[PDB]
Each structure stands twice: as structure tokens, then as C-alpha cells.
Design a protein around this ligand. Structure first.
Ligand SMILES: CCCOc1c(CCC)cc(-c2ccccc2-c2nnn[nH]2)cc1NC(=O)Nc1ccc(C)cc1
Ligand SMILES: CCCOc1c(CCC)cc(-c2ccccc2-c2nnn[nH]2)cc1NC(=O)Nc1ccc(C)cc1
Lengths: 363, 362
């Protein structure tokens, strides 16, 4: 019901690769961003684009592909080469269909995790499994940006954590039937799956370069909420008369991070409001899921009420798995953002969320 | 999409009054609770009842009516006359269908606000409006329990607050189009509607007696979560082998209270977990609505960013309206619970009222 595949999880299973003949002009630009950004012929091709109606995007996978197409074009139109020459107005020809499509899918008109990671992938050979070697991305921004490395390693973590999500029904079924051994194995499988997701995340070092990420890709994943370059926001010509502020990319847009926090009862001020705001950037069905988990019986309260050492240890195994992921996430933010920048605000938020996870330990 | 009527709001519009011929034995008992409890024939009628399948309850209104029927019978079977003679096991021929129906509707197998208030009403004359004089309840527990007074005055507050809910789309539409004057009128209409709901709540004194409420009705609205009488819970024979703990009645089961807290950005520990637990006791469509409001742009953050005195004052008008309702609620809990008892719930209400007071801007 909440669009969560057993294998792929929150990611879009088998994303669509081609749009109908009607949107060939949109597809041409998005597929040639590395060439158009470098030559500078991008903004002219976006400005000389005719206004296409979103009526031919009938199914969810085509609507999601068109959002990925328009989203990547919008970030390339706004940032350009990334040397201060920025655009504060998105042309009517592209801003009104992108906002109509974003309204239909209940997502903000900005490139989001659901678009550039969850719907931006394919299998090279459909016979082989979901491994980096047998996978590729549909869209990139520049040659050498490490977008194949960044988006695929992010996606591989989502697929690794999807194994823990399919265990969630078993957790609540065991609490209803008072099956201690069934509940204990379920909590251990969630912990084992979250530990395996950390090992998958180690592959970032193999396929992403810190200099290329910080000074090339990171520009195209940046938004216009609190950014001094677009202090007031971006004007979506034809749709809104005032500039609108929408946030850029962040690990908080992944529903997997917030999924196990809500499952384990891990509930301050500036950090709490930011994570609640990040749900607006997730697909509507995934927010309805994160919220249905909140209204399910508390796993934390049940384990504490039983006064069982085994269940308390198995609960702390899942908590320690989340702190290990957030600690290693901070280590990667140091390598890919702090070190290249000095050649900070994000770290404080991550340190705060990690301390709240550590405080949720029972032992 | 979230089952919120424009006129009646979260309440069930036009609740069904009769069940199919198949459930006449269930209906007979529920409609005669005052007679069967007083004579003591109730438990014998529940125990000599045959097991009826819930397959003939096809539509939502019939399923909700059957949950109100079985819910009132279950509270009467558990508590009885209310003099310590309590039942710790609900018979298989009523516990299984009630749990099957509760699972289908995604509600706990215990009498809940959605049942005894939202689906427990009718219009005497369909031509006249929704006023206490033109309304009545479908089920009562005892003669003189003031259930018509308690459930109808609770419902009339829900209908009064429903006028504020229909302006919620206007609040978000104004924020998206930067219309300061339409947003200010919208916040003032929410405040005016929540102030009118407080005036409709004053009618409780006219139709409910403190002694009758505390020593008669209150026992049938009590549950088995933390209750020393059913320390372990209630055994739903045939459905679960272990006793289960489900909470009784409270104002927290109303979605209207949490609706405007989420709309205005009003969020400690024991109080926060209790309100999140009370969502489980609300209908599934209503808890999905309270959660969709959380993922909408913050009204509190907008009024603060604009730095406008008018919007700040109109926001505080809605906050002060919530503070007035919670202060008058505490005031009624003193009259109908604290005074009759001397012849804990207060701490929770004082805590949730201080959090509302703290969210004022001025
Ligand atoms: C559970 C999956 C989370 O995935 C991420 C992880 C994994 C952590 C367990 C790490 C990082 C990261 C890596 C290097 C440097 C910095 C960051 C970083 N983490 N926060 N902020 N910056 C990033 C993400 N995701 C992300 O950037 N998505 C996104 C991308 C593009 C758009 C438009 C929207 C969302
Ligand atoms: C939408 C309005 C809120 O409704 C209530 C208000 C209005 C306050 C604005 C007051 C009271 C109250 C009155 C007298 C003495 C005590 C209480 C009391 N307040 N907390 N707990 N007891 C009660 C409720 N509601 C309620 O009892 N519902 C319920 C009833 C039965 C079952 C099975 C489930 C839920």
C-alpha cells in the first residue's frame, strides 16, 4: 500500500528510462547536461524550449522520470558553470510544467532524493543482481562529477536497509502474540541489516572523489532556502509571482534514516523541526508510512515492560547500529565537505541527532 | 479524502440507527442496557448469545454501528453494576466478532470516542438544525447516567470546532500566494470558532450531573490499561490467549484538540507519549489527517518570518482560544471528578496547558 518494494525498498523498482516522443526536447537537454553546461549552450536551449503539457505523463513511473528530467535541468539552469553566474528566474516554458508535475506528485519543485537517487538508476544486465558493477545512473551533471558513484552508493545503502524494513510486520505480529523468541530474532535481523548497510556505505571512498564532489557535484545538489546567492528564493515564472525557497540535498530526505528512529521510539528544537520539514521532500506514500509507524504500539515501551535482558540487548543492537551509521556519516562529511572547504553548520546538526540516538540506549 | 464532513467535522455524518435482521440479538441487548444491568440479566444474555459472523456488516456506517453496539455491551459486561463484581474474560461469541470488526476498522477492541460520541447520535426532526434540543443518543448505560447530556455536549463541541477545520485549506493557500489579509482573516476565524466551541462547552452544566457522571457513567467509560481491577488486562476469549490492556475514555481521543496544536506548531515526555498513543484510538483516516498537517508548511514559522504584528496577534488569538478551552476543561474535571471523588488526570492537563501557553509569541 505505501510503495515499498520487498527487494529495492523505498527506491522506485525498475525506473522508466524513456519518456513519450512528446517530451523529446526535455529528454535531449537532460541527457546532455555535461556537454551543454561545459559549452554554455544550456540556458539558451532551456530558454528556446516550447511549453509542453504534462497530460501525456499518465503513469507514476513516467511522471517520476519527467520530474528527474526537469529537476536536473532546473539545477543546471540555476547554477550554470558554478562561478557566481546564477539565474534567479526559471523560464515559464519549464517552470509551469515542472510545478504542475510537482503538485500532481505532491513534491516540491526542486531536485530531490526521490528523483536523483531512487528513480535515477538501471541494471546493466537484468540477469545479474543489484551490485555497483551491474548498475548505472540515467542522468549526470558534469564529466567527472562522481554522480554515478554518489547516487549509486546512496541507493545501495537504501537497498541494504530495505531488508530490515520487510522485518517490521514480524516485530508487531510478535508483540501481539507475545512471541519473545520471534521478537528477539526480528530485532537482531534489523540490527544485522543496519550493520550490513554501514559496510555497503564504505564503498563511497572507492567511487567518489572529495574534490570532484565538493567543487562540482555539490553545486548542482544545492537549493535556494537560506542560500545567500538566492536570498529571497527562485521565481517559478508563470506559476508563482513571488520567489520561493526550497532546500537542497541532504541525507535527511532518505526515509530509511527516519524509519528506524520511529520504529525504536527515538524521538531537540532546531534539529527536530528540520527532520519534520525533510518529510515534505519525501514521496507522499513514504510520509504516510513513517507516520503509520508512529501510531503503532511502541517497541521501546514493550521491551522495557517485559524486563528481559535478551530483548533489551537486541534493542540496543539496533540502536548501536544507527549510532555507527551516524558516526561514519560524520566521518564522510569531514572528508567530502570539511577538508575540501578549508582549501561546518551541517556537522552540528548531525552530532545533535547522533547524541539523541546514543541517549536512547537502555544499558 | 480523510472523512471530515463540512458541517459535522470529525463526527460520523448521519450515523446508521439499525443493523440487518442478522444482528437482532446484539441490538436487543445494547438497546436494553439500563434494564439488563439493573436486573442483572445482562451477563446471562451475553453468555447465552450465539456467535454471529461480521460478514453481513458490509458498509462503513453499519460496521461503525455494530462497533458501538458491541462496545457498549462489552463495557456493561466487564463492569456490571459497578460494585467490584468485574469480569476479567469477555465470552468467545462476542469477543471474536468484536475483535474481527475492530481489526477491519483499525480500532482497538474497547469503547472509544469515535463510537460513543461521533457515531452515537441522531436528529429528532431532520428539518431542524444540530442543536441539543433537536438531538438524542442511540445508546445509554443506565437510567440517570447523563449519557445523553455527556455524549451530546461532547459532540456539539466537535461540531462547533468543525467550522475552524474547513478554513485550514484557506490558511495554506494564503501562505502560498502571500495574501496577508486573507491569512489574517483565516487565523481570526479559527480563533473565533475555537472561542465559540468554549461557549458550547458551557452547556455541560445544564445537561450533566457531577454525582451521576462520576459514580454511574464514568465506570462504563473506564478501560483496562493500568486499572488495578484488571491489572493484567481483559481476555478476549477465542481471539487472544493473553489479557490485553486498552485505555478508557478521555478528551485526548478527540482529533479536534490535536488538530489545532499541529496547525499552530504546538508540540514533554509522559504527556507527549500519551497523546501519540491516543491517536491509535482515533479512526485511521483522522490520524492520517493529523499527520498530513504535520508535513504541511509551518504556520508558526511563517508568521514569525513575516515580522507582522497583525498576523502575530491573530496567531496568539488561536493560541489563547486553546488555552481558554484547556483551562475551562481542567475546571470541569474539578467539578465532575475531583469534588465527587473526595466524598492524576489534572497533572497531565496542566502540563499540556502550560505547553500551549509557552507557544504564545507576545
Ligand atoms: C541513508 C542514505 C543517506 O544518503 C546519504 C549519505 C549516507 C549516510 C548513511 C551520505 C551523504 C553524504 C555523503 C558525502 C558528503 C555529504 C553527505 C551528506 N549527508 N547529508 N548531507 N550531506 C549523502 C546522502 N544523501 C544525499 O545527499 N541525498 C540527496 C542527494 C541529492 C539531492 C538533490 C537530495 C538528497
Ligand atoms: C471534543 C471535546 C473533548 O471532550 C471532552 C471534554 C471537553 C473538553 C474541551 C470534557 C471531558 C470531561 C468532562 C467531565 C469530566 C471529565 C472529562 C474528561 N476529560 N478527560 N477525561 N475526562 C471529556 C471529554 N471527552 C471524553 O470523555 N471522550 C471520550 C468519552 C468516552 C470514551 C469511551 C472515549 C472518549
Amino acid at each position: 500500500e505505501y510503495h515499498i518494494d520487498e527487494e529495492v525498498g523505498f527506491a522506485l523498482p525498475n525506473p522508466q528510462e524513456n519518456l513519450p516522443d512528446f517530451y523529446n526536447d526535455w529528454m535531449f537537454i537532460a541527457k546532455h547536461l555535461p556537454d551543454l553546461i561545459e559549452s554554455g549552450q544550456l540556458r539558451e536551449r532551456v530558454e528556446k524550449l516550447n511549453m509542453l503539457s504534462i497530460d501525456h505523463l499518465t503513469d507514476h513511473k513516467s511522471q517520476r522520470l519527467a520530474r528527474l528530467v526537469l529537476g536536473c535541468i532546473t539545477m543546471a539552469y540555476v547554477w550554470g558553470k558554478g562561478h557566481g553566474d546564477v539565474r534567479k528566474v526559471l523560464p515559464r516554458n519549464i517552470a509551469v510544467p515542472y510545478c504542475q508535475l510537482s503538485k500532481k506528485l505532491e513534491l516540491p519543485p526542486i531536485l530531490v532524493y526521490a528523483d536523483c537517487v531512487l528513480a535515477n538508476w538501471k541494471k546493466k544486465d537484468p540477469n545479474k543482481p543489484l551490485t555497483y558493477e551491474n548498475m548505472d545512473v540515467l542522468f549526470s551533471f558534469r564529466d567527472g562529477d562522481c554522480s554515478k558513484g554518489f547516487f549509486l552508493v546512496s541507493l545501495l545503502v537504501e537497498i541494504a536497509a530495505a531488508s530490515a524494513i520487510k522485518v517490521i510486520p514480524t516485530v508487531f505480529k510478535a508483540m501481539q502474540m507475545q512471541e519473545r523468541d520471534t521478537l528477539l530474532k526480528a530485532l537482531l535481523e534489523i540490527a544485522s541489516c543496519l550493520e550490513k548497510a554501514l559496510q555497503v556505505f564504505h564503498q563511497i571512498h572507492d567511487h567518489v572523489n572529495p574534490k570532484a564532489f565538493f567543487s562540482v557535484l555539490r553545486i548542482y545538489l544545492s537549493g535556494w532556502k537560506g542560500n545567500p546567492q538566492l536570498s529571497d528564493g527562485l521565481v517559478y515564472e508563470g506559476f508563482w509571482e513571488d520567489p520561493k525557497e526550497f532546500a537542497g540535498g541532504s541525507a535527511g530526505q532518505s526515509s530509511v534514516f527516519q524509519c528506524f528512529d520511529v520504529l525504536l521510539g527515538i524521538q531537540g528544537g532546531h534539529a527536530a523541526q528540520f527532520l519534520q520539514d525533510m518529510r515534505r521532500y519525501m514521496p507522499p506514500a513514504h510520509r504516510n508510512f513513517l507516520c503509520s509507524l508512529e501510531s503503532n504500539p511502541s517497541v521501546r515501551e514493550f521491551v522495557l515492560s517485559k524486563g528481559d535482558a535478551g530483548l533489551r540487548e537486541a534493542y540496543d543492537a539496533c540502536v548501536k547500529a544507527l549510532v555507527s551509521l551516524r558516526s561514519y556519516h560524520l566521518q564522510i562529511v569531514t572528508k567530502y565537505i570539511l577538508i575540501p572547504a578549508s582549501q561546518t553548520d551541517l556537522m552540528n546538526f548531525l552530532k545533535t541527532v547522533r547524541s539523541t540516538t546514543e541517549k536512547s540506549l537502555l544499558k
